[PDB]
Amino acid sequence: MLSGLNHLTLAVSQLAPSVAFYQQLLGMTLHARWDSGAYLSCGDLWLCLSLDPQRRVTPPEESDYTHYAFSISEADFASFAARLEAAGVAVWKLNRSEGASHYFLDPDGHKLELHVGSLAQRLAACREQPYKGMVFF
C-alpha cells in the first residue's frame, strides 16, 4: 500500500543557482549539499535537487503541463506572488483555472505553482461549476 509522496527529485543544470532559488527565494530549508546534489525540505516535502547534464531548458510553450504546486496560506499568497514578480521570476500559463494560483518557472524551466486550498475545497468548488464531463466518486 502506497502512503503518499516520499520525495520529489528535480534534475537541474547548475546546482548553485537552483539551491539559491529554492532556499533563498522560496524559503525552503537546506539540509545538505554535495558536489552533485542537495536535500531540502518544505514542511513534510523532501525535495532533492540532482545535477543532471541532460537537463534542457525548454520554453514553457513547448513543454507539457506537468507541474508542482506548493501550499501557501490565504494571508501570504498575494505578497509572496508579488515578491516573485519583483525578483523577475518568469511565468507560464495553464489551460484551465484551478482556483487561487500563481504560476512560475524555476531556473531550469520546471513548472511551479503557489496554490491556496485543499483537494476537498477544490472538489467543492468543482461541484458548483464543474469541468466538462465531470463525474464525482
CA distance 17 to 54: 17
Taking residues 65 to 104 in sequence order and writing x for each that binds its own copies by CB under 8 A, - otherwise, the string is xxxxxxxxx--x---x---------------x--------
CA quadruple 14, 17, 23, 27: dihedral positive or negative? negative
Q: Which residue, 88 or 133, is less far from its own copies as judged by CB?
A: 133
- Contacting residues for 72 by C-beta, under 8 A, at least 6 apart: 80, 114, 115, 116
Chain residues in the site for its own copies (CB under 8 A):
1-11, 26-28, 30-37, 39, 41-46, 50, 52, 54-56, 62-73, 76, 80, 96, 110, 113-115, 117-119, 122-123, 126, 130-137
